[PDB]
Amino acid sequence: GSSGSSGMSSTSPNLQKAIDLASKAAQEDKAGNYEEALQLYQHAVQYFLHVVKYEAQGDKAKQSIRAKCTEYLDRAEKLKEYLKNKEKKAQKPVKEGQPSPADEKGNDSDGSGPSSG
């Protein structure tokens, strides 16, 4: 009886890559690699989407993948805030846009004004 080795549905190349990518990202993070984990975390999603775009599978699959895209996307967002925190201090913007209050008060009332005078 020749075993009919056959079950796991033949997955697409784009999807497979997305999985491996995402997996690698984590492995790096734990190891201590954030800069590398970030990139991967991004790619994984990029591919995942492409699949659900045209090479999709089913309403059930779409969500299954999407859920991962959001998760990985959020995780990466953080690695960025950390990578920049250590990265060489970022110079401050000059003449970009300073905050200011609304049209100065209107009514006028008697009062004091303690200031350098």
Residue ranges covered by each domain of the chain: 7-89
* Cβ 32 vs Cβ 79: under 8 Å: no
Cα(17)–Cα(43) distance, integer angstroms:
9
Q: How far is CA 13 from CA 16, 47, 96, in A?
A: 5, 10, 46
Cα(46)–Cα(97) distance, integer angstroms:
34
Per the entry, the structure determination technique was NMR
Instruction: List for the chain the helix, strand, coil content (%; round to 5).
Output: 55, 0, 45
- CA dihedral sign, ordered 81, 85, 91, 93: positive
Output b/e per residue, 12-50; b: 16+ Cβ within 10 A: eebbebbeebbebbeebbeeeebebbbebbbbbbebbeb
Cα(26)–Cα(51) distance, integer angstroms:
21
* Number of Cβ within a 10 Å radius of residue 51: 21
Residues found in the chain: 117
Cα(92)–Cα(16) distance, integer angstroms:
43
* Number of Cβ within a 10 Å radius of residue 72: 22
- Helix-helix angle 59-86:13-31, to 10 degrees: 30
CATH number of 7-89: 1.20.58.80
